[PDB]
């Protein structure tokens, strides 16, 4: 009633599926298309699938089953994504670690998650003497097999990945959460099979999912950035032109540091900070579709998306399809439109909660007295203060 704002109604984005289903569909439908480009090395979707499958079978032999958590720590490049996909194909969920993660934090996170192990490279294996958990190398997980190993299937209720944010706090995202997010957001972004997608985010960040898994969803080609390029905005601008990139997921401060426009960019998805007006004016051109995505990690990558246009005020926009937002008071009561309260998010992509933290989970994932379907019974309290304006639009106002 103007005080509960919903994204478009799209029940077809909820399927009886897991991430392995989405990727396998793409690889079997487009075997010979290039999936991954690292420098001058390229891997096809079919190649990627068979290699990741061999790795997943090795994980199975070593005891990885659906519902397990496997840590991921490798340098940016093909092997890193390959290993992510191998964990996924084994039916386990992955716990991603940035290149710059200290070994002690790795140990704290693997312990907190009760992970059965982690994947890393021969080189980095020695940095992990402090890690008591099992460490596998991608290399050993890539050796030939004598007889095939049958992979147990995971289910939508099972975790797809665990994101840590610091006492470390692990956020459990389910297969259902992430598969729905991918379909819901791509229905608006519309990444296409012909697209060439820059892959610059560390796997430890939400926007890596928009770079990688949206592409996997439609069979786009990923160009994987080296560590040295990620901190060189002018060189990156020239790289994006020379590599004929069409899709940039990035943060506003990075876009602002580009000297020239990059004409070949179909889609520009800015997340993290609300895009400033000067940047919109500089970039919200006709040959660019410039977007602003907002959302906590606790509701799978993004919860709202906004089309940016020169001269139009910037807001977080409307919820994604099947997402919903409302505002509540200090005692969890729905507020009339226009008042200021805590922004709450609901829908099929609300995370399962905080790993091993029933306390904080119950504090922040509460029952929704106002759910109009079984996919709306869980409200996540963002902690942000917000108001719903006279146009059904949510306005952020800072923390509570
Ligand atoms: N979700 C990220 C920033 C927003 C990304 C939106 N595509 C975070 O919570 O740190």
Author numbering: 8 to 173, 178 to 411
Question: Can I see the authors' text?
Answer:
To better understand the substrate binding in PosA, we solved four structures of the isolated adenylation domain. The α-amino groups of all three substrates, L-ornithine, D-ornithine, and L-lysine, interact with of Asp217 in co-crystal structures. Glu221 showed charged interaction with terminal δ-amine of ornithine substrates or the ε-amino group of lysine indicating an important role in binding. Density for both ornithine isomers was unambiguous; the electron density for the lysine ligand was less complete for the carboxylate and amine, suggesting the longer substrate may adopt multiple conformations in the active site of the crystallized protein. The adenylation domain showed modest activity with L-lysine and a reproducible low level of activity with L-arginine and L-histidine. Michaelis-Menton kinetics showed a preference in the apparent kcat/KM of over 160-fold for L-ornithine compared with L-lysine. As Met218 shows 3.9 Å hydrophobic interaction with Cδ of L-ornithine, it may play an important role in the specificity of substrates, since CHPAs adenylation domains activating Lys have an alanine and PDAP synthetase has a phenylalanine residue at the respective position of Met218 in PosA. However, the apparent kcat/KM increased nearly 10-fold for L-Lys for the M218A mutant. Structural modeling of M218A mutation showed an increased volume of cavity in the substrate binding pocket supporting the role of methionine as a steric hindrance for substrates longer than ornithine. The assays showed no peptide peak on SP cation exchange chromatography nor the presence of lysine polymers with LC/MS.
Here, we report a δ-poly-L-ornithine synthetase from Acinetobacter baumannii, which we name PosA.
